[PDB]
Symmetry: C5
Subunit: 103 residues, 5 copies
């Protein structure tokens, strides 16, 4: 099993690692129909999204998605340093697959 975010990311197609080593700059949350999502940006301008649960989402992935949004909201409020993001680059904003935080 992957021991870290980098090996984990290399296991999928259309994913790429982003090394930020910085806290989340802004956090956006929408409850709007068909746009139930979260968007975070960093000071340098990089924007990422936690993708809206569509048909392409099982039931085990639906829970991890809700988990990710909880993680991002609390990481933002506590000014936690996000180290890396593994994202799907075939989507705009890039969609978050994984996150790693290191104090």
């Amino acid at each position: 099993t992957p021991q870290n975010i980098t090996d984990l990311c290399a296991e999928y197609h259309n994913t790429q690692i982003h090394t930020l080593n910085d806290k989340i700059f802004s956090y956006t949350e929408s409850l709007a129909d068909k746009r139930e999502m979260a968007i975070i940006t960093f000071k340098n301008g990089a924007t990422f999204q936690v993708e809206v649960p569509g048909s392409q989402h099982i039931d085990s992935q639906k829970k991890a998605i809700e988990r990710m949004k909880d993680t991002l909201r609390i990481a933002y409020l506590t000014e936690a340093k996000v180290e890396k993001l593994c994202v799907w680059n075939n989507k705009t904003p890039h969609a978050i697959a994984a996150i790693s935080m290191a104090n």
Copy 2:
């Protein structure tokens, strides 16, 4: 897919962006019949609500609504600065569609 709240807001009818750049002054939560909701106000007097989950709302929307109330409660308690709010202006108080927080 919107990259920010302003663009995401523009995709709906009767919406409106409010720039508060202020912490929530008050938080009111009700569990009373057919009024299971949260109401927030800012020092400027602005009052907003998170609509009661009802008939129109499907499941992904019912949980986004629950997440929004969680978000406002934790934002109120941590004194987080709310930047903008996308609201449906055809309701009173205006109902919240999305929220952005910055730094």
Copy 3:
């Protein structure tokens, strides 16, 4: 729609508003059979409870009751000032209907 706790409290029968403007003094939680509830008191001796979830009332009522217990616990831990409580006075301790927090 009601825009504050006093107006919302008035739409119900035999309710009453309590102005505390103080933090919760103590928080009691019970998982014991038929008394799965939370009880809070203020330094002045006022004691309030969140009703135990009964079958006949709808599940949105059940979610709101659960949220209210989450809200009281975190308000207690963070020493948040509670402004007013709207309660059903036909119960003792008085059962909470709504709560407002403001500093």
Copy 4:
């Protein structure tokens, strides 16, 4: 309804009130099969548990049990002083029925 932990505890069989007036010394959590539980200890050596949710527990019981585990974790991490604990003393460690927290 009971208005405090002492009165509530006296409504059950084989219960006992423990007065701690101290923060939880340690918190243990287990996800191992049939040992899904939380165990807490205090400086004075007292050890208490939250029972595993067997398929004997009513609907509301399983949910109150999950809440208690959330409460113990957050009380531990915030160093919240625990006032009294009502436990069923016919189990080892004694099983928690109710908890009161007061400053």
Copy 5:
């Protein structure tokens, strides 16, 4: 029945206790298909995972898995000192079965 993490860990096969007495160094969360897991690291490099769910995990087991992920996330965010870890050593990285935290 078991009163601490050591006794509880000894009740399983392929488990072992790790004494760390230190805060989590890094936290990794993944929402990716088949890798919906959490990975933690300590300062000396030691890595542990909370295993991805499956039908092997009865429903009560899946709840405890979700709870553990929540616990590691706030423990990391709060820099809480983790004392011991009971892990399954037949997997790589070693899978977490129980955690104990003592300040």
